[model samples]
Target: ICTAKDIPMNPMCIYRSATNRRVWELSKANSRFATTFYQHLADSKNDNDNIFLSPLSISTAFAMTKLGACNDTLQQLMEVFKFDTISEKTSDQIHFFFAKLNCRLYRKANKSSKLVSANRLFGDKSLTFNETYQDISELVYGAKLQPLDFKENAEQSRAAINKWVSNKTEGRITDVIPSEAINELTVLVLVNTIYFKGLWKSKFSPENTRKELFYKADGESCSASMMYQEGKFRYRRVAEGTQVLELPFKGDDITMVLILPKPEKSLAKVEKELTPEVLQEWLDELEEMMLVVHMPRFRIEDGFSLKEQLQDMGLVDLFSPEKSKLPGIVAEGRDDLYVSDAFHKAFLEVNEEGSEAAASTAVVIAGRSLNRPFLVFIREVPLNTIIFMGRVANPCVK
Candidate 1:
């Protein structure tokens, strides 16, 4: 008999099931979202700036928000979530997917790493919420429902949310949602934070890390702390002049996959072609072999307000007051409930050891060095899920 109490170390972790397959499909859908979101962010950035975002963090927050959504607002969010085409029981399946992920990927504190994904909801005290929505928030999302008097104490509420985010991310992320972004009209603030720090399976020698020149998009160069390693890892050369390398962590369950463009100037083209099908094809082409790797030691901290971009991506009704309907959020009197904003913040670091909170190598007997521009996807291999995605244009910038 499998009980909720049996989840932490259940035998299901060892034995795979059909439910696990479903979870992987959901995660693929998540990776698809990550690719789309990354393209948007890449297109909006400069040639020499660092770009990083947790599509998992952004998607999880919105998924929780969807529980409270209704009517056209729910449908629009469903489409934005890629739910219509992915699953028949989109909402129910999504809830189950997260539940399975929470069970499967729960952080196991050991000699290697610490990974945390947490969700929370801060609702306005003046508003009355539906019990059904509250139940789903707690049960499926593991979200703590905290009441804040946003109408009277907006700043305090904002600070409280900031503190929660910092605490959840182990202080790796703070000031995620600006004070100006949270106001009295903010009926509810939904947040998700992901913090990952993994040790390399084959740790890079700290002494080998030195300042090296990293080429930028506009034919410029900057000094970066390039971490070097020589190890056997899965590698591949996919279409459109891209080299894929999968760097495993100590546990091997999670891997950081790097899709490096052969020429420095091809990064833009690579970004445009970064779709789920192409990514799968690249993964299929990977094979284990030995290679020397040169990776930049970099840290990226990024925040984005996805309201306008999501609207532009066909999530328009959720932001429109007239079209939006989230009766489950504040069921008492408010009919104009709509998402005013969606804020997401992500932090990542790669160094000699691995990722502080947060790749690869083999060749057919040839050395592979990422001395130029590249794209990174921090993924959990078993689920084919991307927890973080970023572009490393100029590692020296931050």
Candidate 2:
């Protein structure tokens, strides 16, 4: 009961550690980003079309890119992430928090559920990158600013980057960077991949699945297979005839949350009103209730090339050749670099087979080249990703 001051009377009195609070703080920030981002993405989408993308997947890549950004470029990035509020309050590198959260999600690995997070950057073979940025990139984000012959062979570079993601996600996600997403002008590419497969805690019986007529918003009907089960689950009814349901995976650490609006007409209205605060209010109201559940058997594979969307959403400088201020990307000097394009893809499958989902995002930076001192990055040369970046301050055998 003795927690009232900036300097606490007892260190042990505070139950939540600083990083733990940061983890919570980061989650809230990402939630805010999630809603705002979805709204922006929703603006351009056709409403009747099945839409899905991982906000976590997109945000992580943006957070890593912020490492190399400064000035308005950095400011806008932080604002879009909803990270500016927490960011202005503290810390040198947001990577500390990212690394902390990364560890938290990855903690339940080798258990009943499968989850994977990956980041790999494709940069020109000789372009210089900031040492600190690279440090956080590899150790914190579990990645490297992989050097590639992007200037000469954009096609092969795209293939190798896509192939690695293929390995990272099996075939659930493929071709993150389409043939047109990368060009010879591309000097660097930022990619973050997310994959998860979870067996539901309450497995649906295969025999209960049936082909039912499903209706689209425009009143078109198609026969779709739907899954059925009866169980006690976390359910909530908040507003607009909307319902929220959370189905946890086997280990109970990960979950699939769905929102269903009665009669389909309210879907648009609810979408217009969805906010992190509102979403949390609904989430907080959940309590276990016994009911018959019928979920649609669904599969989605989609990509969004978001250069215009990012630009329209106040991220003006990062793409501008002159206005972009990316000093932290280069090893020594020069600020001529700018993000060229933004790429994203999401895949989701749901049925009696359970949930398998994957999402990835990449950013391309145009303009770059390099030269240096006796430092080395322990080049894997082939993978183009370095596991280490230790210095060789003194090296003269002669």
Residue-wise lDDT of candidate 2 within 271-323, one digit each (tens)? 66767677668768999999888776666676877667777778889888878
Per-model RMSD to reference: 8.9, 13.8
* lDDT string, candidate 1, 9-81, tens digits: 1110011015566677677777777788777777777645677777777777777777766666777766776
lDDT of each: 0.70, 0.66
Query: What's the TM-score of each model vs. the native?
Result: 0.88, 0.84
* Candidate 1, residue 210: how far the Cα is off, in Å: 1.6
lDDT score, candidate 1, position 126: 76
> How big is the positional error of residue 332 in model 2, measured in Å on the Cα after superposition?
4.2
Error of 1 at 259 (Å): 1.3
At residue 114, candidate 2 shows an lDDT of 76
